[PDB]
Design a protein around this ligand. Structure first.
Ligand SMILES: Nc1ncnc2c1ncn2[C@@H]1O[C@H](COP(=O)(O)OP(=O)(O)O)[C@@H](O)[C@H]1O
Ligand SMILES: Nc1ncnc2c1ncn2[C@@H]1O[C@H](COP(=O)(O)OP(=O)(O)O)[C@@H](O)[C@H]1O
Ligand SMILES: Nc1ncnc2c1ncn2[C@@H]1O[C@H](COP(=O)(O)OP(=O)(O)O)[C@@H](O)[C@H]1O
Ligand SMILES: Nc1ncnc2c1ncn2[C@@H]1O[C@H](COP(=O)(O)OP(=O)(O)O)[C@@H](O)[C@H]1O
Ligand SMILES: Nc1ncnc2c1ncn2[C@@H]1O[C@H](COP(=O)(O)OP(=O)(O)O)[C@@H](O)[C@H]1O
Ligand SMILES: Nc1ncnc2c1ncn2[C@@H]1O[C@H](COP(=O)(O)OP(=O)(O)O)[C@@H](O)[C@H]1O
Ligand SMILES: Nc1ncnc2c1ncn2[C@@H]1O[C@H](COP(=O)(O)OP(=O)(O)O)[C@@H](O)[C@H]1O
Ligand SMILES: Nc1ncnc2c1ncn2[C@@H]1O[C@H](COP(=O)(O)OP(=O)(O)O)[C@@H](O)[C@H]1O
Ligand SMILES: [Mg+2]
Ligand SMILES: [Mg+2]
Ligand SMILES: [Mg+2]
Ligand SMILES: [Mg+2]
Ligand SMILES: [Mg+2]
Ligand SMILES: [Mg+2]
Ligand SMILES: [Mg+2]
Ligand SMILES: [Mg+2]
Lengths: 132, 132, 132, 132, 132, 132, 132, 132
């Protein structure tokens, strides 16, 4: 029912649009104001915040949210650090998007429940669509 | 079924491994010999070639393969040129990977049959999967 | 007659100066403010705008102008993007300058009506000129 | 009608292909060997030579030719040197392609009979085509 | 007193040279063979290995060592990954060099017992030397 | 005591924060106005200036200050030039941060009084700390 | 007795300094105002002008000067065109500084009375100094 | 009667050519193999080596040669490093080419015996030549 999406890039905004279509509350948060405005018309609540800030994550009660998606791609260090802060925040289910195999290794060990690699994961499905 | 995959990045090598694991024969083509060596381990045939060159594409005999996947990610110019050359060669089905909506629309004008956006489509799937 | 010229390099400023000298109103658009200032002296209206931006083109109202000339030379990606946006904005006649035979074919697929190769066409013209 | 073309870029090859189609003797000279091979199919004679070399220009015997087209654009200094060698060699009429106004004015001062600026001239001609 | 140093950079060699002079056993590990040869004459044992490889760290038996110093600075992801693997290997105390404040924040959350920032730490020491 | 710190990166701002916390008045100079702003918060006086310029250094009156710390790290040329100009200005004591042994030798020849290699000196410090 | 120096770089400023110290009239001309101001203290008259402009060279009675030094190095076209304009203006002796051998060839063919190549000529001079 | 010239630009090859023409035996050293090849035609011995590397200079045995000329022009860092290494190797007389006065002063501090600034010194020489 209630979801949170951190990082509103091309991947993160795509999650927000589909989540809203199924009638679910989505908290879209992004450091960049422009990207938050784009998702403002597609989510229940759009907030400009830095999710690397520990106190900011405390205020945004992410432990209440059923699932939290971290969709930060360019800065590998932010996604790793935001994943950790969400874990101490009490988030039971943490989904993290990783662009590299080395990042996906770190995220697995630090405790991410689901690691998403869009290029590798889309590669497998597109092959399956080609086969059938 | 015989497939041709152009570009051997994260998406291209994932499609080849899935298409070769499913029992199909794949021709992996890339300009980087390092990635061609990686693909040559499991693909039926791997060739180091430039797929924006008309004579080179004629040499690869891409019209024989029923489906041609172009997975050139960073170089949008190379992706569009490869799609154009493959379509002119007489490839029945051309699948192209696109990073943005503008590249996807240009490829639609070029004549690409299926266009895959890894980030957006993976976001849609992640949203559906979180919705269970 | 009203003409819109996008890109104010050596070719674009020559078209504007020739078009305006004949009594036609020209709109000169470029991202480089120096060349927009240089054209503003003799051009009916000069605007500093990015014509690959689809919302910006709607503001320019390029659908009103009878012919739109896109004279972006160095940036081929910007050339195809501007042609695509102009066609999607409902421009009846789009003339595009192309620096290569591969760019010209992509522009033909996009929907450009007249494509000018400055080096090749001027070569043919001077070859005819020397003969006669 | 006997012609010589120096520099076999896009412009030079276009002058060679139009001149040969009209049915006149053309000498194509270019420092780069594969461009000479490309032009050899069309022109009567294609020679790989350096036209900034005084003795080479003397051996080419360019004073016989009715018109000499110097189509070197990338390096302005090579085009200037070759115009003077040609004019010292005794060529009656020398046509030179210039990419910049500074190059065009230098070539006018040194004695080029015809200076071709493909961007400006094609700009004027394209504007005239747009008018009618 | 038995020590291990991972990463034979300028910081790593300085630790290795000072440790051996006192009379304690030092294991020097670096992915690059050239740097391992440099410390081969300055440590008890110098091994070329990849310390982000989980099985390799097990073979090295780093849990026997009293202290391990991870001195990988150029690639932030390797230092984080090596720190986690060392902690999982059972090492009691792990000293990690961090070049950036963002890296040091992650390493503290990971569990590194001592984070060394050479620019910040030497900045304080140098100032105190200026005082007296 | 009056101190002058040139370059306000990690080392330079750490020396200034320590010097001012110890009750000393420090001058912070940097070409990056962004970093001069953080220093100006806690530094007695902060100036945006280029310290490789002789007239600029004469304007700063660095000869008044007891010690001049030059903490230009990435640009070794700027570090050498700043040390040379400071010595020619007439400053009694110059402390220079050097990231290379060769740079340290060149600075010794120039006339620097104390040269700090943060990586190597921090390595020695850390080794001594682990030993005891 | 009376000299003119065009271009006030490192070479031209040295020419002006030596010429004025010897006791002669020197008209120092440079398009850049900073260098003209720098040479204003030394030379009899320092003028900011573009010597590529033909009317400016006509206004500056360079034909009255015994010798004219053209010391433009970076832009070869500027030096060639300034030499041509000075020769057309009636200057009997024109000394031109050339940085490359192709530029020297062009200047020799144009008609410059003296071509100065500082690196080669000092190469010979310091070789002779080393020998004796 | 034995000289070593480091760097084989226009200045370095001119010193070599003159030194070998006067009967002396020159060792030409450069990192660019093309210039070492062109110098090897007339110099006594030519070596492709990096002269900023301490062990390489020891292999070259530069202490044997009475005079060592360092003609590295573009890379000021390489010029300073080569001068330092040659001086610490035990070369009695080191001549260095310097582009600017700041590099010249740094080289004076390093220990260079003769410093040649080609532009300024040719300015002085040409001024004296025009005077009488
Ligand atoms: N600390 C952060 N807190 C919140 N959002 C962030 C943070 N760091 C990055 N983001 C956002 O995460 C998104 C991921 O985008 P990314 O793929 O990294 O770059 P790009 O937008 O260039 O493709 C961006 O919209 C970015 O603003
Ligand atoms: N003209 C071309 N012909 C064939 N392959 C190409 C061409 N241009 C790029 N490629 C390949 O396409 C692949 C796509 O790589 P890229 O998307 O840049 O990296 P990644 O997939 O790791 O993000 C590259 O490995 C590159 O070698
Ligand atoms: N996205 C864009 N929108 C509008 N104008 C552009 C865009 N990209 C490039 N231009 C303009 O097109 C002009 C022609 O480009 P170019 O061929 O590089 O210059 P020139 O024709 O003088 O060599 C440039 O002056 C540039 O400012
Ligand atoms: N010294 C020379 N003698 C003869 N031909 C030359 C010389 N220098 C250059 N050329 C030729 O002139 C041509 C100029 O073409 P250019 O405008 O550079 O085409 P492009 O811009 O596509 O490289 C080149 O193909 C080159 O081979
Ligand atoms: N996975 C790894 N396992 C072991 N050692 C590594 C690994 N990755 C990097 N290193 C080593 O860590 C050292 C850190 O060196 P660093 O000081 O960052 O290099 P630089 O001086 O070029 O910045 C490197 O010499 C490298 O060889
Ligand atoms: N000429 C100069 N005068 C003053 N400050 C300079 C000059 N050149 C560089 N700096 C500054 O000196 C500092 C050197 O630190 P640097 O190593 O570049 O960054 P960091 O230590 O943060 O990694 C930077 O703040 C840089 O902008
Ligand atoms: N058209 C011109 N008229 C007069 N002076 C010029 C002209 N073009 C360039 N100059 C001057 O000639 C000087 C020589 O330039 P250059 O050889 O590049 O010296 P530097 O490398 O120190 O800039 C430049 O400082 C420039 O100001
Ligand atoms: N570390 C080095 N060791 C030896 N030779 C060098 C080194 N660095 C540069 N050189 C050489 O010094 C020569 C002079 O440099 P440069 O001034 O760029 O050439 P030019 O005199 O043609 O402008 C170059 O040809 C270069 O190959
Ligand atoms: Mg994005
Ligand atoms: Mg990819
Ligand atoms: Mg143009
Ligand atoms: Mg060409
Ligand atoms: Mg290091
Ligand atoms: Mg620093
Ligand atoms: Mg200069
Ligand atoms: Mg030189």
């Amino acid at each position: 029912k209630q979801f949170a999406v951190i990082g509103l890039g091309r991947f993160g905004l795509a999650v927000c649009k589909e989540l809203q279509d199924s009638g679910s509350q989505v908290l879209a948060v992004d450091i960049n104001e422009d990207r938050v405005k784009e998702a403002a018309g597609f989510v229940s609540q759009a907030i400009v915040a830095n999710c690397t800030h520990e106190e900011t994550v405390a205020e945004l009660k992410l432990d209440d949210y059923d699932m939290v998606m971290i969709a930060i791609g360019a800065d590998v260090n932010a996604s790793i650090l935001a994943t950790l802060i969400a874990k101490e925040a009490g988030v039971k289910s943490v989904w993290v998007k990783a662009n590299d195999r080395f990042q996906a290794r770190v995220l697995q060990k630090i405790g991410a429940d689901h690691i998403i690699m869009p290029e590798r994961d889309m590669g497998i499905r597109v092959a399956r669509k080609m086969l059938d």
